[PDB]
From Swiss-Prot, chain A:
Degraded during macroautophagy. It comes from Homo sapiens. This is Ubiquilin-2. Plays an important role in the regulation of different protein degradation mechanisms and pathways including ubiquitin-proteasome system (UPS), autophagy and the endoplasmic reticulum-associated protein degradation (ERAD) pathway. Mediates the proteasomal targeting of misfolded or accumulated proteins for degradation by binding (via UBA domain) to their polyubiquitin chains and by interacting (via ubiquitin-like domain) with the subunits of the proteasome. The ubiquitin-like domain is essential for its inhibitory effect on GPCR endocytosis. Mediates its association with the subunits of the proteasome. The UBA domain is essential for its association with microtubule-associated protein 1 light chain 3 (MAP1LC3). Mediates its association with ubiquitinated substrates. Homodimer. Forms heterodimer with UBQLN1. Binds UBE3A and BTRC. Interacts with the 19S proteasome subunit. Interacts with C9orf72. Interacts with HNRNPA1 and HNRNPU. Found in a complex with UBQLN1 and MAP1LC3A/B/C. Interacts with EPS15, EPN1 and EPN2. Interacts with HERPUD1. Interacts with RAD23A. Interacts with TARDBP. Interacts (via C-terminus) with FAF2 (via N-terminus). Interacts with UBQLN4. Binds CD47.
UniProtKB/Swiss-Prot annotation, chain B:
Belongs to the ADRM1 family. Residues 1-110 form the Pru domain. It is found in: Cytoplasm; Nucleus. Component of the 26S proteasome, a multiprotein complex involved in the ATP-dependent degradation of ubiquitinated proteins. This complex plays a key role in the maintenance of protein homeostasis by removing misfolded or damaged proteins, which could impair cellular functions, and by removing proteins whose functions are no longer required. Therefore, the proteasome participates in numerous cellular processes, including cell cycle progression, apoptosis, or DNA damage repair. Within the complex, functions as a proteasomal ubiquitin receptor. The modification Phosphotyrosine is found at Y107. Ubiquitinated by UBE3C in response to proteotoxic stress. There is a cross-link at K14 (Glycyl lysine isopeptide (Lys-Gly) (interchain with G-Cter in ubiquitin)). This is Proteasomal ubiquitin receptor ADRM1. The Pru (pleckstrin-like receptor for ubiquitin) domain mediates interactions with PSMD1 and ubiquitin. Preferential binding to the proximal subunit of 'Lys-48'-linked diubiquitin allows UCHL5 access to the distal subunit. Component of the 19S proteasome regulatory particle complex. The 26S proteasome consists of a 20S core particle (CP) and two 19S regulatory subunits (RP). Interacts with the proteasomal scaffolding protein PSMD1. Interacts with deubiquitinase UCHL5; this interaction activates the auto-inhibited UCHL5 by deoligomerizing it. Interacts with UBQLN2 and ubiquitin. It comes from the Eukaryota.
Length: 78, 110
């Protein structure tokens, strides 16, 4: 059963360092949100990703515009 | 109100070349209740806001392009992804060219 092994490179810029995560090109944002909160141990609802002038949340889709192929995103709590 | 505002023309990337618009625009820095900084380009004629983007620290940079005969061409480059916006000062004197740039960088990253 294929689940698309197309793992994209998402670089998370946080107020600490710049770590790179690996997620499938067919997953929901909510799934990623809960991943960051567990790995970095910060927040989930207040955890907002940024793609230069654009807010990334569970309203849009990272694999749709945010991360096309190895891009840098920011993390804020506003 | 606008935190920072100055007359500057926008540029449009056509195909693979940055073509400057001859229109008169006003680059202003706005801040909403969401504490999000908004960088918008307002047309001085229609009064409509075309481009509106949310600015965040540790990912924005506004500097002047040295390779320009006029020396009034500034560029807003993001450190996230691929975003390079070019603008040219439409102010009467260059006395506040750098001053405006300094303000922008401050209010954007801070």
């Amino acid at each position: 059963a294929p689940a698309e092994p197309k793992i994209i490179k998402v670089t998370v810029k946080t107020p600490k360092e710049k770590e790179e995560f690996a997620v499938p090109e067919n997953s929901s944002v909510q799934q990623f949100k809960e991943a960051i909160s567990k790995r970095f141990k910060s927040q989930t609802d207040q955890l907002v990703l940024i793609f230069a002038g654009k807010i990334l949340k569970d309203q849009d889709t990272l694999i749709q515009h945010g991360i096309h192929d190895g891009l840098t995103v920011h993390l804020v709590i506003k | 109100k606008y935190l920072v505002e100055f007359r500057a023309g926008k540029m449009s990337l056509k195909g693979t070349t940055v073509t400057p618009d001859k229109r008169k625009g006003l680059v202003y820095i706005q801040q909403t209740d969401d504490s999000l900084i908004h960088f918008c380009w307002k047309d001085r004629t229609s009064g409509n806001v075309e481009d509106d983007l949310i600015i965040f620290p540790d990912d924005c940079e506004f500097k002047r392009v040295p390779q320009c005969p006029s020396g009034r061409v500034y560029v807003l480059k993001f450190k996230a992804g691929s975003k390079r916006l070019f603008f040219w000062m439409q102010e009467p004197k260059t006395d506040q060219d750098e001053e405006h740039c300094r303000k922008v960088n401050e209010y954007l990253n801070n």
